Design a protein around this ligand. Structure first.
Ligand SMILES: C[C@@H]1Cc2c([nH]c3ccccc23)[C@@H](c2c(F)cc(OCCN3CC(CF)C3)cc2F)N1CC(C)(C)F
Ligand SMILES: CC1=C(c2cccc(O)c2)[C@H](c2ccc(I)cc2)Oc2ccc(O)cc21
Lengths: 225, 231
């Protein structure tokens, strides 16, 4: 049924599944970042269930995709909220942090710097929230797909649908065929830098280890049920 | 002159710039041990690196960048570039990685190195996806150049933005080139968009593999080295 969606219905569904903007619990820096990230994880589960073609997959497959993508998804949301705040990361509306505040934690300013650069690449492209929910979904289905045959064909048909959607959004905003091609690529090439940031960030979270730091296969299996 | 080239001119330059296929050092002791296989793979990798630099300098637009920027693109890209060459070579050996004509290894021969099978599996999976997609050599060389220009660009002043913008325009010329390759093949406009997307999404996984790959190596090239080789 998700394969039957028009471009507009795809965006309407993705825009209507958006998670809400959470606030940072205080009224220690690793503490606020960690607690916030745990709380957005809960909302990300119910976001992912609403991504079209996601619940068409077995729960095993659903959780492998979330396991591979959760940090990328957390990060692309951070970068989106941060577009209109050059030089700062809008973790929460009461947690806007600058490059200098990354230095309070050994290891973080490197990820902080990569997130800022992605945020200004979205600013200098004037990334639209319709395109952004598209990329966020692309990340969900794409980042673990390559690890049975009916499942990865269906995922690749839904990913072909979101490509159609990105092209449609670009045609309706007036861009020529050529500008449509180029913008799609520039948007998708940024996903590979987002992958790099997730990997480096994952890497920091194990040196960071206060133990049981990262969402395990079984924890994620419970939250979707 | 890079930004005036026609699609077919870009395909041409890229195809001639391809580095040769090399051979692994000849009759090592087999069966391998962990130290001897890592020794071969390393020595083969190092020898490919020299040819990669000559390759890099012939990628339209690369030599327009400052020495320092060229090195940084390479420091960030070189393992993805090594790994996509392997996947390409190994497309016609299902279940095998053709590291060299004389070094064709299956999954089980990757267990000889602790931590390596996990990497092996990823590389083989990618090679199977390129098979499933019927990846073309003309597309291959466009994606490789895309890797070289893109991976290091989000890490790069008036001059620094000119550097950034020029690279982004060359990437835009490589996109048009892939699209021309697809249009000329007879694919529809929708099919063109979808295949361009599927290919570019594959570069996200190639980035994952290079990162895990870099992790694996540490668990077991300098700026100065790449810069000397570049001049
Ligand atoms: C700055 C980035 C990204 C980031 C962190 N915060 C966020 C909150 C909202 C949006 C983005 C973020 C933070 C971060 C995080 F993303 C996760 C985390 O730990 C989660 C622990 N939970 C146990 C649950 C399993 F059940 C997972 C701790 C963090 F500081 N940071 C990760 C690093 C640099 C280390 F890559
Ligand atoms: C992908 C890859 C290696 C690889 C890398 C990491 C993990 C792994 O399992 C294999 C390994 C390698 C070994 C040492 C270095 I220095 C670099 C690459 O040997 C290679 C040789 C040639 C080539 O084109 C690719 C590889």
């Amino acid at each position: 049924l998700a394969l039957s969606l028009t471009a507009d219905q795809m965006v309407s569904a993705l825009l209507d599944a958006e998670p809400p903007i959470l606030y940072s619990e205080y009224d220690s820096m690793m503490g606020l970042l960690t607690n916030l990230a745990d709380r957005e994880l809960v909302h990300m589960i119910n976001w992912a269930k609403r991504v079209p073609g996601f619940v068409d997959l077995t729960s095993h497959d659903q959780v492998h995709l979330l396991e591979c993508a959760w940090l990328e998804i957390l990060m692309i949301g951070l970068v989106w909220r941060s577009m209109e705040h050059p030089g700062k990361l809008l973790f929460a509306p009461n947690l806007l942090l600058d490059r200098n505040q990354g230095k309070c934690v050994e290891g973080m300013v490197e990820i902080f710097d990569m997130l800022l650069a992605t945020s200004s690449r979205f600013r200098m492209m004037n990334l639209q929230g319709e395109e952004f929910v598209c990329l966020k979904s692309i990340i969900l289905l794409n980042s673990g797909v390559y690890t049975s045959l009916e499942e990865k064909d269906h995922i690749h048909r839904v990913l072909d649908k979101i490509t159609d959607t990105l092209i449609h959004l670009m045609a309706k905003a007036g861009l020529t065929l050529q500008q449509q091609h180029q913008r799609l690529a520039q948007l998708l090439l940024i996903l590979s830098h987002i992958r790099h940031m997730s990997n480096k960030g994952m890497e920091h979270l194990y040196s960071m280890k206060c133990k049981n730091v990262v969402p395990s296969y079984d924890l994620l299996l419970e939250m979707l049920d």
